[PDB]
Design a protein around this ligand. Structure first.
Ligand SMILES: *[B]([O])([O])[C]([C][C]([C])[C])[N]C(=O)[C]([C]C1=[C][C]=[C][C]=[C]1)[N]C(=O)C1=[C]N=[C][C]=N1
Ligand SMILES: *[B]([O])([O])[C]([C][C]([C])[C])[N]C(=O)[C]([C]C1=[C][C]=[C][C]=[C]1)[N]C(=O)C1=[C]N=[C][C]=N1
Ligand SMILES: *[B]([O])([O])[C]([C][C]([C])[C])[N]C(=O)[C]([C]C1=[C][C]=[C][C]=[C]1)[N]C(=O)C1=[C]N=[C][C]=N1
Ligand SMILES: *[B]([O])([O])[C]([C][C]([C])[C])[N]C(=O)[C]([C]C1=[C][C]=[C][C]=[C]1)[N]C(=O)C1=[C]N=[C][C]=N1
Ligand SMILES: [Cl-]
Ligand SMILES: [Cl-]
Ligand SMILES: [Mg+2]
Ligand SMILES: [Mg+2]
Ligand SMILES: [Mg+2]
Ligand SMILES: [Mg+2]
Ligand SMILES: [Mg+2]
Lengths: 233, 196, 222, 195, 226, 212, 204, 195, 196
């Protein structure tokens, strides 16, 4: 048992017709102090999987090393390491899910919430969640922390059920993700303007976007707000 | 919360962020923490929103009744009424208030009233959770008898940094200018102050 | 302090017929006041004509089901591909659950299938492995809402025959698969109305001598 | 204190109450009478926290005696039980509540019927054919459920009461030093000196 | 609970879901969370149901007496001031979280109130367990110079986000529109997107199914003549 | 839970209720609180359902291994002591068990041992165990004799559980009766309290308090 | 310890076609110990019926309080109180004890004598009014009652049909609750006749 | 369990131990023998936490019986008491200590002297003319301080023991259901069947 | 404690105050918090003195054994050894360490290791209780590729302010310069840095 020290906030994601999108901001908070402003919380594994991690950053870096080591180990005595016997999103997730549940069972958890986003060999979209308790679930949209409360409602308006996935394009899906990231910046006190976004498409492959910013913000109406009730000036 | 009041040549300027939080949720991103207790006596509020509002409302009532009987009150008098409420009810209040006002005789004055209910007259004052991150900056950059434009830049740069590092601070930077000329409200948006 | 347990909500329901058995469960998965998924399968085909669901804390639920599926696999390896009977599966699950007596799987488990005489069977477990064969059992969050209804409408409890006035009970006539599915659907619709952790979808697994069939129905999403 | 029992038969109410008073590891007394006569045809037994029991009982006694003098009339057992309940219901939300449980056995001279009321310290009143407070009922109610009949005589009621006390003396861990038995009927209140 | 308030061109609209809960159980499926303080001052309430009702009735009662005393139509700032000072005095123990809106001779107004007595001003506001879902919608679709039709749509959509995504909210959407120079229109059950489907079976029992011990007529009438 | 067992002329009577609860919630009315260890040994269950049922089911395996090794049935003393020694190892860990081990052998005759999770092991003629044990004791002690007929002893056991089922909120459902003799135990049916109460009330003239 | 579940008990109310029904169990206990099987929880003031679950001392106290108040109402108003008005009186009376409440779950049932409209309502311990069209539930088996009512109930039931529905809702709910049962009473209420029926149920 | 007494007279040791076994609110048994014969001329009575008492007593019994067979010789009471003390002294610093208090009454055949040892669960040993564990000594020691003479007979010891039990039955709150009395002398161990 | 490490054109400079406190008592006013784990790999220590010493001693041992086998270790390698100790023993340690070193290939590098045992490579880093008061100042005044004299002034001014406001920081300002030229120790006394 411990407590999280340096922490990362929401990771948000959704499925679309040809793949999956995942995003997370670049902040490493130290309680109320916004300590580290250049933290990458989306970690790609091969060219078909992106693991988005929130919560304790020291445990994130540990998980990052496990995944790095997993790729190395998979390549050993494996002539088809870059083909038929490459790491799948489902393999990577199940491994993490096993570790998370084992660690919680020893009363020494990895203090994280994780979303594994990717595309399988047969082109099927993969999107599944796991956290410090070893709890797992899948959904057309997935989000951690504040994202669960604010991003999911917005993303579910685009893809409300399974049958909405083929009707959703990559442009519409990315637009929804970017809007959600803006809303989180308005309302989450442990978020930053800077974020990373990753698209895993079955046709165009893995597109990893860094140094994105929240833009088109509405603040002008603030000038008209005066006092807390009766004050006019 | 990041709040400050700075005296300068022509008077005094109050400054504040606009963030109200319930834990990590931002309950209000466009809050007005610069509140009026008299024509040219204002205050910056930090701590409990309910407490500081209740206090400010009572002070405004006291100074309105003071004015009807004895004419315009001094900034020191306003600070004393704040103090009396904060000190005597210290067990039940969480309020960090900066009182700032402009007289013609005394010019610009700033009084800070921290948690205990003590009073401290200062050339400038900083308070709130975000103030911790700008003690170094403000101490190095403050000068007495600055111009209006210099004081605005000083507050803008200071609160920008406080906002940058403090999770409980954010939104727009509100400012209120108190001089002989009158009362001027200023606002500065994220796109402006973040690139500083 | 770290709390190793959580509550994922949901509700399950097993009903044993004369030559069939059903195991139903809603597809909603939650934490506190948020929905994790509107469709997260909770009832599983474990092989050998046995269906299983472990409702409560989903991580323990998945772990237990995974370990039982494993037990079925090794039962085949060790005993010449012999079919694991429902009674033997139930005893095996008791030992899986009681093995963690001092750090329990925080779940209410129900399995369903056919006994060795071909008759419908439902077994029900508490978190630490106490079990019992039953004709009827609801489990999980809305179990307190559903069970009384099943006592009334499946076992005809507190029902008597008109004209006699409390003297002659209503006879315990058997229920068809069509009749049971109606009671399952009404049970979950009623539970969805008054329980916030129940909704989204209903997935029913029906077990007969022919095998395992599935049926899905929509539930209210609020 | 410990055990207080009550049984309403055909023409009377019988109250049985233990004689022991224990503080800590010592039985200070073995002849204590845990009851007060509220009126000629109304008796109240009591058990609860030390001091509170007697203080409450005597306070009730004084109030009923005051009513009797003022009106030159005896209140019905039902009326007395309602007064007692209100005092306890008032008490439970006080600064320091009366920690006292009571049985009220009375004979209504108007209706010519015996009446037994069980009231706990919360002000929970019930009229019963037989009653008990504390751990007594855990033993005695099963016996009374089996044997009790509504037309029993006073002598049959005492025999059934002896069977209750015998069971308590066999299975209860505490030595309650026997019971004082009192009968309430049309002729008033009397004590059974040999039990 | 999901409650919202949205300002528009010539007035203000408030909305609310209709679910009340005790723990994980739904106590009432069609609860009324929009309260009338005065004819053109309405407020939505979240938190403890008895408190939101009681505090609204009390202030509404005193507002009425104040209106009669002054020969003036009541103002939203008066309701706001009376509510906050009452709630502050009780130090958050009166669990009322309110969105107060209305029109008066000064104009149209929108405020929020929290249990400890703090007030906030805004063009759009949301309170309750579903406030995050509702605020996500409001932050995505709100703009300046909304029409009456657009504000109702935005307000109801914000409630729906709470209904579908928050387990503490559900059932129906109630709305009240308060436009300047007009009567306030209270739209009870404006939307009804959660009607229960027909049951598979009728559970009407045969008469005589229940075992009875005794029967008797109950005298509800007074003591009779003659 | 209410369970009892008593020695008499015709061997042993064992009677149990059927209710299981989780707080105020009635979890089951059809629980088998008597466990058939072998054709001559019975065990009663009170307290934690899983604890009792796991370890008494386990006890049967140990008893079967004994008679395989020793070519002779296990004594009631030895069977009871296997269980008491087992729970004693777990003492402090939080097992919750109150049990009677009832049987007959040639060397012992009819024997009852009370075994519980604190490690207590007691031989005796009469025992009542569970939340409704006091209610059962009332009926049993006032009506017990050594010279009871199998028929009368069975009814007394049935009636004592009924008494506890009525008054104890955590007892009820139905009554399971067993009769243990020189030639083994004999099941005597499940008796629903909902029907048994009214039957006993009418025939016996008891429960005059209740209206029917 | 928990005041609302020391004594145990339940109340349920339902509307029908030109009729209402209110029913309760008869148990009063001290936790596990069953004490009384004659503790009725339904009372009436004129034609307005009130069921109360929860702490038994408060059940009795509130009955006496509302008898007190409805009697004064009648003397001053020169008419019997109506269900709608009585509901407000219950709510007012409970809320005045906001920070020292009666630990009860009241349920009002009746027919308005002027309009003829069936009326039911439920409350929490501090006064909140739940005015349902279909049914109201209260007590230690409220979860069970919700499940029974939500499945068994259908609108516009005739008095004699409504009796069967509410009786089965109560009985089967009570049988899944340790602190409820020990007998039951059902009131069938029409505009100018009221029938009271004691139900035969299992006594454990 | 509750009350265990011991008295060493001229030519014997007398141990008296209560017969009651109580769990919660029920006396499950009223004929329980709280003692074990360790050797032909050594008896040990015991009281403490449920389960631990018998488990400890039988464990000690087995060890002394093993010694007896191995050496074909009976250990002295002093030697047995020292062995028992060491086991309890070892136990008190274990993961889960034996919560058992004992009296050891033996007749040393070598010295021709009766001997009584009182040992508590901590491993605190004392040789005494008379002893007790629990709340028993709070009553019985004053009586024994007055009446006990060292040259008393076995019959005088039993009479003095009856006076102790009578006092306990008068003043102790718990009904311990009488005592089983056993005498240890040169001829071995025997039980007084009427007491 | 106020500690910092700053990379610049010629390499890296470590800086620290010299105060050790037991509550409000200054147990050591001339503490050396700049400690050597290898020839040109040093660290700044904050938190528990016992913990950070024990850690530093173990790291020095590991790097000495590394050197004997594999030659001079990189600054990244040294940071990794610190991390391994801090991360794996996070439940039992209170250590905030800044690792700074100079390679010829990689030049000046700075790695900060806060309480959790995470690693963060940065152009410059600040840590300790007193660092809170100079986040604003340091963020505004830091530039990349500064000169030696500029970097010394930056650290001197920064730690001066941290000392001024933080009670747990004080005494002398120690500094260690890491370049290709070698290792230089600098010290600055109160009379010098207080008047800044
Ligand atoms: B600021 O953060 O101090 C701010 C100033 C206030 C006058 C608007 N205070 C708050 O946001 C407080 C919490 C708090 C945060 C940080 C330090 C001290 C206090 N919030 C509230 O009072 C609040 C939050 N939600 C609803 C109502 N009130
Ligand atoms: B909403 O969730 O805020 C809603 C709004 C209310 C005004 C109708 N609140 C409730 O449903 C509250 C939740 C709550 C539960 C327990 C303590 C405090 C608040 N429920 C009730 O007020 C309630 C519950 N059961 C019966 C009556 N009222
Ligand atoms: B009985 O009441 O002891 C009973 C016997 C058991 C074999 C079913 N035990 C229980 O009902 C216990 C709770 C309990 C109640 C009263 C006294 C002691 C214990 N319940 C369970 O063991 C249980 C098992 N499965 C589901 C729910 N509860
Ligand atoms: B500094 O204040 O962090 C300092 C750095 C240390 C490496 C010399 N630490 C201390 O002075 C600590 C206490 C402390 C103060 C502030 C923050 C964190 C920790 N002091 C000690 O470890 C200490 C004090 N007295 C004797 C021994 N050790
Ligand atoms: Cl504010
Ligand atoms: Cl040091
Ligand atoms: Mg900020
Ligand atoms: Mg639902
Ligand atoms: Mg009572
Ligand atoms: Mg019941
Ligand atoms: Mg019962």
């Amino acid at each position: 048992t411990q407590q999280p020290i340096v922490t990362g906030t929401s990771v948000i994601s959704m499925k679309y017709d040809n793949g999956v999108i995942i995003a997370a901001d670049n902040l490493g908070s130290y309680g109320s102090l916004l300590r580290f402003n250049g933290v990458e919380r989306l970690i790609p594994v091969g060219d078909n999987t992106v693991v988005g991690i929130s919560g304790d950053i020291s445990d994130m870096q540990h998980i990052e090393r496990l995944l790095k080591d997993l790729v190395t180990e998979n390549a050993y005595d494996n002539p088809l390491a870059d083909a038929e016997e490459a790491l799948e999103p489902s393999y990577i997730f199940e491994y993490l899910a096993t570790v998370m549940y084992q660690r919680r069972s020893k009363m020494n958890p990895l203090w994280n919430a994780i979303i594994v986003a990717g595309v399988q060999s047969n082109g099927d979209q993969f999107l599944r969640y796991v956290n410090l308790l070893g709890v797992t679930y899948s959904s057309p949209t997935l989000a951690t922390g504040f994202g669960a409360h604010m991003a999911n409602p917005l993303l579910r308006k685009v893809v409300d059920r399974e049958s909405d996935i083929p009707k959703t394009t990559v442009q519409v899906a990315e637009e929804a993700i970017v809007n959600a990231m803006r809303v989180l910046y308005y309302r989450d006190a442990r978020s930053s303007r800077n974020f990373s976004l990753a698209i895993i498409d079955k046709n165009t492959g893995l597109t990893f976007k860094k140094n994105l910013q929240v833009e088109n913000m509405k603040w002008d109406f603030a000038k008209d707000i005066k006092g807390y009730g009766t004050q006019k000036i | 919360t990041s709040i400050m009041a700075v005296t300068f040549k022509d008077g005094v300027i109050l400054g504040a962020d606009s963030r109200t939080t319930t834990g990590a949720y931002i309950a209000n991103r466009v809050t007005d923490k610069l509140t009026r207790v008299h024509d040219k006596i204002w205050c910056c509020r930090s701590g409990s929103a309910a407490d500081t509002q209740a206090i400010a409302d009572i002070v405004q009532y006291h100074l309105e009744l003071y004015t009807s009987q004895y004419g315009t009150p001094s900034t020191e008098t306003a600070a004393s009424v704040f103090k009396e409420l904060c000190y005597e009810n210290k067990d039940n209040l969480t309020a960090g208030i900066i009182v700032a006002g402009y007289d013609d005789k005394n010019k610009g004055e700033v009084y800070t009233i921290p948690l205990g209910g003590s009073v401290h007259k200062l050339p400038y004052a900083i308070a709130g959770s975000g103030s911790t991150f700008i003690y170094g900056y403000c101490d190095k950059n403050f000068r007495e008898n600055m111009s209006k434009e210099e004081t605005v830049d000083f507050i803008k740069h200071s609160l920008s940094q406080a906002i940058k590092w403090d999770g409980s601070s954010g939104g727009v930077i509100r400012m209120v200018v108190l001089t002989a000329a009158g009362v001027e409200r200023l606002i500065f948006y994220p796109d402006e102050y973040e690139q500083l | 302090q770290f709390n190793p347990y959580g509550d994922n909500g949901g509700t399950i329901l097993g009903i044993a017929g004369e030559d069939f058995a059903v195991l139903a469960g809603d597809t909603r998965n939650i934490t506190d006041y948020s929905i994790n998924s509107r469709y997260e399968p909770k009832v599983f085909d474990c092989g050998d004509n046995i269906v299983m669901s472990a409702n409560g804390f989903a991580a323990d639920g998945d772990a237990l089901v995974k370990r039982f599926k494993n037990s079925v696999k090794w039962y085949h390896f060790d005993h010449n591909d012999k079919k694991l009977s429902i009674n033997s599966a139930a005893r095996n699950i008791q030992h899986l659950l009681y093995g963690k007596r001092f750090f329990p799987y925080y779940v209410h488990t129900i399995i369903a299938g056919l006994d060795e005489d071909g008759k419908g069977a439902v077994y029900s477990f508490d978190p630490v492995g106490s079990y019992e064969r039953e004709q009827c059992r609801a489990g999980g969050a809305a179990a307190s809402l559903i069970m009384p209804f099943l006592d009334n409408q499946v076992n005809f409890k507190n029902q008597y025959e008109p004209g006699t006035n409390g003297k002659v009970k209503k006879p315990l006539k058997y229920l068809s698969v069509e009749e049971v599915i109606k009671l399952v659907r009404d049970s979950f619709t009623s539970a969805t109305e008054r329980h916030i952790q129940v909704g989204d979808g209903l997935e029913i697994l029906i077990v007969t001598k022919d095998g395992v069939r599935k049926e899905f129905y929509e539930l209210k999403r609020d | 204190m410990d055990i207080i029992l009550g049984i309403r038969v055909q023409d009377s109410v019988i109250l049985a109450s233990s004689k022991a008073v224990t503080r800590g590891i010592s039985v200070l007394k073995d002849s204590d009478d845990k009851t007060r006569q509220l009126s000629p045809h109304t008796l109240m037994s009591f058990a609860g926290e030390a001091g509170d029991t007697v203080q409450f009982a005597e306070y009730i006694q004084a109030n009923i005696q005051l009513y009797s003098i003022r009106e030159d009339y005896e209140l019905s057992p039902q009326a007395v039980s309602s007064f007692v309940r209100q005092e306890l219901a008032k008490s439970i939300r006080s600064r320091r509540p009366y920690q006292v449980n009571v049985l009220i056995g009375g004979y209504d001279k108007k209706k010519n019927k015996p009446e037994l009321y069980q009231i706990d310290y919360l002000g929970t009143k019930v009229e019963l054919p037989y009653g008990a407070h504390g751990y007594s009922g855990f033993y005695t109610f099963s016996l009374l459920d089996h044997h009790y009949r509504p037309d029993m005589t006073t002598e049959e009621g005492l025999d059934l009461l002896k069977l209750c006390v015998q069971e308590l003396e066999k299975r209860m861990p505490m030595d309650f030093k026997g019971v004082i038995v009192k009968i309430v009927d049309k002729d008033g209140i009397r004590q059974v000196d040999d039990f | 609970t999901t409650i919202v308030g949205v300002k528009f061109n010539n007035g203000v609209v408030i909305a609310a879901d209709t679910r009340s809960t005790q723990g994980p159980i739904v106590a009432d499926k069609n609860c009324a969370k929009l309260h009338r303080i005065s004819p053109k001052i309405w407020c939505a309430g979240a938190g403890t149901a008895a408190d939101t009702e009681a505090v609204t009735q009390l202030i509404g009662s005193n507002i009425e007496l104040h209106s009669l005393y002054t020969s003036r139509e009541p103002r939203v700032v008066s309701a706001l001031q009376m509510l906050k000072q009452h709630l502050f005095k009780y130090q958050g123990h009166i669990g009322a979280y309110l969105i107060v809106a209305g029109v008066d001779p000064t104009g149209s107004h929108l405020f929020s109130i929290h249990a400890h007595g703090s007030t906030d001003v805004g063009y759009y506001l949301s309170l309750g367990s579903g406030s995050l879902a509702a605020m996500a919608v409001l932050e995505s679709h709100w703009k300046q110079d909304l029409t009456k039709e657009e504000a109702i749509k935005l307000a109801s959509d914000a409630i729906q986000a709470g209904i579908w995504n928050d387990l503490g909210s559900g059932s129906n959407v109630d709305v009240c529109v308060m436009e300047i120079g007009k009567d306030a229109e209270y739209l009870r059950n404006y939307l009804t997107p959660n009607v229960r489907e027909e049951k598979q079976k009728s559970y009407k029992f045969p008469r005589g199914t229940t075992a009875v011990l005794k029967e008797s007529i109950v005298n509800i009438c007074d003591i009779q003549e003659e | 839970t209410t369970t009892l067992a008593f020695r008499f002329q015709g061997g042993i009577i064992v009677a149990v209720d059927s209710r299981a609860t989780a707080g105020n919630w009635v979890a089951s009315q059809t629980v088998k609180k008597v466990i058939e260890i072998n054709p001559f040994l019975l065990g009663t269950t009170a307290g934690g359902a899983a604890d009792c049922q796991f370890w008494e089911t386990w006890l049967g395996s140990q008893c079967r291994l004994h008679e395989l090794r020793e070519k002779e049935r296990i004594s009631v003393a030895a069977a009871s002591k296997i269980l008491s020694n087992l729970v004693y190892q777990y003492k402090g860990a939080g097992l919750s068990m109150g049990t009677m081990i009832c049987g007959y052998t040639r060397k012992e005759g009819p024997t009852i041992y009370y075994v519980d999770s604190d490690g207590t092991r007691l031989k005796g003629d009469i025992f009542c165990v569970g939340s409704g044990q006091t209610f059962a004791y009332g009926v049993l002690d006032s009506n017990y004799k050594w010279d009871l007929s199998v028929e009368d002893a069975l009814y007394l056991g049935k009636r004592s559980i009924l008494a506890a089922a009525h008054r104890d909120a955590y007892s009820g459902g139905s009554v399971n009766l067993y009769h243990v003799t020189e030639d083994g135990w004999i099941y005597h049916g499940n008796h629903d309290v909902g029907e048994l109460f009214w039957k006993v009330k009418e025939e016996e003239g008891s429960f005059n308090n209740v209206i029917g | 310890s928990d005041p609302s579940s020391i004594n145990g008990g339940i109340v349920v109310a339902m509307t029908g076609k030109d009729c209402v029904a209110i029913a309760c169990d008869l148990r009063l206990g001290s936790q596990s110990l069953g004490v009384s099987n004659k503790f009725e929880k339904i009372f009436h003031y004129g034609h307005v019926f009130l069921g109360i679950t929860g702490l038994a001392t408060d059940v009795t106290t509130l009955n006496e309080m509302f008898r007190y108040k409805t009697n004064l109402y009648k003397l001053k108003e020169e008419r019997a109180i109506e269900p709608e008005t009585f509901t407000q009186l219950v709510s007012s009376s409970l809320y005045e004890r906001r920070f020292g409440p009666y630990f009860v779950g009241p349920v009002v049932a009746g027919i308005n004598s002027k309009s003829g409209k069936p009326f039911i309502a439920g409350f929490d311990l501090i006064g909140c009014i739940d005015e349902a069209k279909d049914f109201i539930v209260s007590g230690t088996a409220s979860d069970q009652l919700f499940g029974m009512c939500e499945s068994l109930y259908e609108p516009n039931l005739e008095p004699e049909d409504l009796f069967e529905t509410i009786s089965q809702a109560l009985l089967n709910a009570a049988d899944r609750d340790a602190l409820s049962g020990w007998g039951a009473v059902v009131y069938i209420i029409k505009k100018d006749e009221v029938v009271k029926r004691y139900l035969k149920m299992r006594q454990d």
